[PDB]
From a paper:
Glyceraldehyde-3-phosphate dehydrogenase (GAPDH) is a highly conserved enzyme involved in the ubiquitous process of glycolysis and presents a loop (residues 208–215 of Escherichia coli GAPDH) in two alternative conformations (I and II). In the presence of inorganic phosphate (Pi), GAPDH catalyzes the conversion of D-glyceraldehyde-3-phosphate (G3P) to 1,3-diphosphoglycerate (BPG), accompanying the reduction of NAD+ to NADH. All the structures reported in this paper have four subunits: O, P, Q, and R. Each subunit contained two domains: the C-terminal catalytic domain and the N-terminal NAD+-binding domain. Two anion recognition sites, “Ps” and “Pi”, bind the C3 phosphate of G3P and inorganic phosphate, respectively.
The activity of EcGAPDH1 mutants was measured in the buffer with 40 mM triethanolamine, 50 mM K2HPO4 at pH 10.0, and 0.2 mM EDTA at 50 °C. The results showed that the enzymatic activity of C150A and C150A+H177A was abolished. In C150A.NAD.PO4, all the subunits have two phosphate-binding sites. Phosphate in the “new Pi” site is around the catalytic amino acid Cys150. Phosphate in the “new Pi” site is around the active amino acid Cys150. This phosphate will lose the occlusion from the side chain of cystine after mutation. Secondly, the catalytic cavity increased almost 6 Å3 after the mutant cysteine to alanine, which allows the “new Pi” site to occupy the phosphate.
Residue numbers in the entry:
A (entry chain O): 0 to 333
B (entry chain P), C (entry chain Q), D (entry chain R): 1 to 333
The structure:
Amino acid sequence: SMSKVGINGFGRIGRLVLRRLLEVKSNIDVVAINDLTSPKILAYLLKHDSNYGPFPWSVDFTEDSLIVDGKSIAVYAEKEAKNIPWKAKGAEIIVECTGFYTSAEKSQAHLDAGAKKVLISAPAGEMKTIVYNVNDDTLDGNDTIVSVASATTNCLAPMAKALHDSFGIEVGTMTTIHAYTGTQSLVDGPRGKDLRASRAAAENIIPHTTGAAKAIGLVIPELSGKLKGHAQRVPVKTGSVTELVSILGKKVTAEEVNNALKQATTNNESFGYTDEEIVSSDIIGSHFGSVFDATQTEITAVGDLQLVKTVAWYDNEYGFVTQLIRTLEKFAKL
Amino acid sequence: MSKVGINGFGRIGRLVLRRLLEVKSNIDVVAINDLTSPKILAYLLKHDSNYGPFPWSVDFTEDSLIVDGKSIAVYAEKEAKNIPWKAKGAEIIVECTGFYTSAEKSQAHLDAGAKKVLISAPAGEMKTIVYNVNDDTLDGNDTIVSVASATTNCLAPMAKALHDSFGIEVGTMTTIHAYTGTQSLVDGPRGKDLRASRAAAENIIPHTTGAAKAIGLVIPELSGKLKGHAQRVPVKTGSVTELVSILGKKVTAEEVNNALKQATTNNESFGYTDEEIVSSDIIGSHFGSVFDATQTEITAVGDLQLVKTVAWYDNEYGFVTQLIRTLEKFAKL
Amino acid sequence: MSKVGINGFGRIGRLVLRRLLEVKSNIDVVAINDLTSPKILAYLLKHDSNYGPFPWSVDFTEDSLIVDGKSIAVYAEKEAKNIPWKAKGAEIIVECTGFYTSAEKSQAHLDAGAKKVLISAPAGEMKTIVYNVNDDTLDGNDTIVSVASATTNCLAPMAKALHDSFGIEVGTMTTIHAYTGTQSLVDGPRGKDLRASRAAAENIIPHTTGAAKAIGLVIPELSGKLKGHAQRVPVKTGSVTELVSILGKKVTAEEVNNALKQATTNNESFGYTDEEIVSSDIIGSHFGSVFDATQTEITAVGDLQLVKTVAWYDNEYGFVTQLIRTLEKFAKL
Amino acid sequence: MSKVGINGFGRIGRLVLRRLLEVKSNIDVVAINDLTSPKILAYLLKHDSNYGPFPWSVDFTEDSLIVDGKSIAVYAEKEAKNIPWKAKGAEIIVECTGFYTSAEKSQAHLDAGAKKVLISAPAGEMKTIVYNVNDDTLDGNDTIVSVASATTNCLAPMAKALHDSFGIEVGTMTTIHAYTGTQSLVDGPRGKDLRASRAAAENIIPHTTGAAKAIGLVIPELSGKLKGHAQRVPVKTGSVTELVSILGKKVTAEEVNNALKQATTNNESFGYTDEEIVSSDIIGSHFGSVFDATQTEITAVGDLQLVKTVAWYDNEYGFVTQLIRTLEKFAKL
Ligand SMILES: NC(=O)c1ccc[n+]([C@@H]2O[C@H](COP(=O)([O-])OP(=O)(O)OC[C@H]3O[C@@H](n4cnc5c(N)ncnc54)[C@H](O)[C@@H]3O)[C@@H](O)[C@H]2O)c1
Ligand SMILES: NC(=O)c1ccc[n+]([C@@H]2O[C@H](COP(=O)([O-])OP(=O)(O)OC[C@H]3O[C@@H](n4cnc5c(N)ncnc54)[C@H](O)[C@@H]3O)[C@@H](O)[C@H]2O)c1
Ligand SMILES: NC(=O)c1ccc[n+]([C@@H]2O[C@H](COP(=O)([O-])OP(=O)(O)OC[C@H]3O[C@@H](n4cnc5c(N)ncnc54)[C@H](O)[C@@H]3O)[C@@H](O)[C@H]2O)c1
Ligand SMILES: NC(=O)c1ccc[n+]([C@@H]2O[C@H](COP(=O)([O-])OP(=O)(O)OC[C@H]3O[C@@H](n4cnc5c(N)ncnc54)[C@H](O)[C@@H]3O)[C@@H](O)[C@H]2O)c1
Ligand SMILES: [Cl-]
Ligand SMILES: [Cl-]
Ligand SMILES: [Cl-]
Ligand SMILES: [Cl-]
Ligand SMILES: [Cl-]
């Protein structure tokens, strides 16, 4: 069993990866970290978190390492993945969280740099892409580079799966009202080519493209090409919600849709259920990838024309991370 | 009837007066009712967190505002039946408190000596007006009317245009809506709406709204064919409405965009953009709705088609501009 | 041991219960009074926008909350003299409504059957306790006591240490303070504080506070020597207190900081940090005040010296841990 | 001189243009350098999250902006020496990038054919100007000059008036300051400054500034007498500076306010308010600083006296107005 892990990109997602690993007392062992800064700065960011608060374990550092819960972790500072000295500590599986290696072509650099497998924390083109407890059974021993898609995908997928299986989804469109992230702007200024991303993220509702629905065929093959959607990025720091409007393959009531979602969430560590009147901050630190909200279910019908709107919460930082880590633990034991 | 009183000199009520002054209306605000002192109403009029300084002079006396040199009586009667509207001859009441959103309740303004009420919110089965959609329905004998919600003013012009051009068979709405005074600053009781008891500037809060459900009051042919809800989020004003529809015809995005553009032409109430705007860009809008071509989306599989269309709105000032047009026509009957 | 009643199950009132259970306190909370239904209180206790899910089970009946399987009676009496405290034998009331902040007002809890009241806000000239500064001034005869504001609880430990080590000749205080429920979500009337009427999540808002003015109730040697005020800013909790002092002695930054470290040693109410923290890092703190040596500043010209000292506080949970420490001593008397 | 280039079409860079157009300056912006396309600078000039739509037409080509029907070249040179300032006759450079804050560094604008540079930030030991305090120190032989920070333009007028009337023997400043582009959107490395790495809109963030430390360049007799810092907070623009001074005379609050009223009278750079304003009320201010008499505070204990004076400022637009004033005068020498 491959127990030894490297994290590339010790950011929002990367830091939480470590946090979650120590929280579930995993046999997986983080032996090296690569970013662009000093151990001092990484230690400060790891110790102090604006969203989840103080790190639950001891954090200290050296000129070339972090010391977390008494255990030493090497820190490297290589912009180019192929130069990361992963063999020095035996980093076997790389959790790729930088945002700059989101393809097989790009992420294979880690293999050149001496790692064995790569798990990418973002969509990454047409490669094996896993949403745990939806399609993790498609994983095998020959998968060497894998994607876990976006938080949004981990939110949409299990909801869509439940619907697909119970009723059919003949066509649908998704809007996620999504917390702001590092790809957006603090103040109005250039942010590559996306004009909207240029705008101050905490002062606006900002429409934003996402591939979650578009590329859903990678997770649920039978819905391939049948979903579209987008994001409205809004001023909350983490916690998001996905709405899916579907034409289903069967006439339904709200109760029928809600019972089917309940069943699919039963005995399911990835996919939660609620009928409580919750709001976005209640999902912060969720250990699910998705939490279906029965109180938002809505059936609109005129004769035989039926629209069905299903809604699910997700903590796009930690909740997602819990999915990444479930996927990682299975990856390592193949 | 050129003389007006305002009940509820709140976010809507105050902007009502700003807008009347902005368009040099021959309507005359003579009286204002609220729950507080003139000092406090005057500070609030003078200094606005969303729109900045009042462009006119503002002073007060122990019973009045003086706005741009003109005296406006202030009353503090929590029951509308006790507002002395006849003292300064207030004929038309712009009801902006949120406590009289029905025929039965706003009757109190007429028992109190006014002739007409225009309610700044939905109010059941009464004439409900979205200006430049169904304003031709207003009548000389109408005494109590609604301008519905800001959300309704945003949805209706979009739904009207899609209805006329393609037909809407069924549809559902979500508005990503700026927070409002019906919500809470900090977590705490807010009557019986549990979601509304939560800190509004720190949460995405789902919230019910009749905008889609009551659309039949504005566009009879769409009666019962829409439903919808809001997601309240931390921006102070400026909101967006997404409508997802099954249309009566197969379409292209370009065809939808051009139909909509046609409907916005020479339309003081319904605006158009294909610029990559965000919500703060709608703050101060003088339209009730601004349709956004950049977010049009056609999802097609074989014969099936879903069409997502989206319009922005300044739920405060933009809605107010619709309220004033509706009031300018209401007063000349 | 003792049985308590909570009046005002609000931001402070709910966190009092959370903290009592977290420390496995002997105190049993037996009754709660507020203005609403058990359903609404259970919703609010369960789901907290600042601290997340309640760590215990929460349920309700028509007259009660059930928390970790223990029943707590719920009443809805706006006048404290009508709260049936005797029905469950609540002898110590934790007064958290904002409406009984005087000895004559909180007396009504004793007329209703309680023995002692601890008030969760400044309450005039009464025994006013900052735990680990002046908790020794409590005795078997006190029946109504105050714990001051969160700001007093931030200020008084810093001021006491400076007092004891160097003397404070005079000083002034400014706290950059999270917004609270006394402010407004949207621009609108809020009693006679004009500034409190303005949208709290969208402004820096100057705001009056007695923490400095009434510090003598907690540190008698400093009566009349300190003034200050707050700037309310848009963070939901997490506040910081700066104090500019002329000290009695003449000092280096290092020396100020050593004095404060000693004062924070084996002191569960008052903490120290030399880490570059920001306000969200204090959220959930089990201190009333955390002195920050990084912000210490000595400005000096000739024999003239200004000393600025800065301390953080979670005005919500942090304060509450102080209230609970004080509440535990006050029960045992 | 009437021919200017802007390096750094950022928050400050864009408002420079907006302001020159607002005052009908007979300076013309002929060229603009940044790191992006004309399409992106046009989108940004046209849509502003703080100040709304551009008041004038904005269009572009692949190498220019068309603003109010006039062409302005756009270049994208990382290094200032590589900028074709020569080409359109760029005489005075407004250096608003943050990256060329010295004489040596802004030299490069001269090495590429510009005469003068006006830097929009503190720039070490060079001629540093707060308009209507020390603009009389500008001469014809000046090439590279600074207008310091917004905080310096806030602090200087107030300090100047206190110094003239009473003397400041020593003093310390805290500015409660709107977040800027130098801070982080989410927790992440921002060079070596640990505090600047933290999410700016979710925290009160202590932060260093030289406004007080370098006041000597603006007010030579206050040299080395002041210190201070900032608490960055979650508002988008609009800040406030607090100064605690030991003055050279005993004073009342009335005496301190009248002296400030006098200094502000027919002073287009420095404003006065007796109204209970909040940060958003300063947004769009045409002053560098607005002294607020409602926050003046005198703490007296015998011969010892601390005086807190407080001034508001729009760190974006308000600072800009000072910049222009200085620019217009720099041009004519
Ligand atoms: N934030 C979310 O909501 C979220 C959710 C799910 C997935 N993701 C995805 O996870 C990835 C990381 O997101 P994030 O939000 O943590 O971003 P982030 O900016 O917080 O973190 C990126 C980290 O990588 C470092 N980095 C950048 N370039 C690098 C390089 N060449 N080499 C090494 N380190 C480098 C940065 O210094 C930073 O620590 C992205 O692909 C993102 O799309 C994000
Ligand atoms: N804010 C928006 O986005 C928006 C948009 C469109 C319509 N509306 C509607 O307009 C109405 C007002 O909304 P708002 O945002 O201005 O509310 P708000 O809370 O800002 O204002 C309400 C005003 O009414 C006063 N008031 C309350 N009860 C009263 C009584 N019994 N008598 C007299 N005055 C009383 C308050 O003091 C306050 O000044 C509501 O019906 C609301 O649904 C709001
Ligand atoms: N930062 C803080 O929030 C903080 C810190 C220290 C002290 N305090 C003090 O504690 C007290 C409460 O502050 P809060 O933030 O919890 O307020 P809050 O508004 O969150 O809580 C008040 C609660 O009291 C209830 N209430 C109001 N009037 C009542 C009455 N007559 N009878 C019974 N219940 C009533 C409300 O329904 C609400 O649940 C205040 O005196 C406040 O100054 C607050
Ligand atoms: N924001 C404020 O409140 C404020 C107030 C007073 C002074 N200032 C000062 O003004 C300057 C600009 O601040 P800002 O807030 O506008 O920053 P900003 O980040 O908005 O603007 C910086 C602009 O410079 C551009 N840029 C960066 N490097 C460049 C280069 N090498 N060549 C050309 N362009 C480059 C960026 O693309 C951006 O458009 C800073 O020096 C700051 O200290 C800012
Ligand atoms: Cl590489
Ligand atoms: Cl898509
Ligand atoms: Cl509905
Ligand atoms: Cl005081
Ligand atoms: Cl300094």
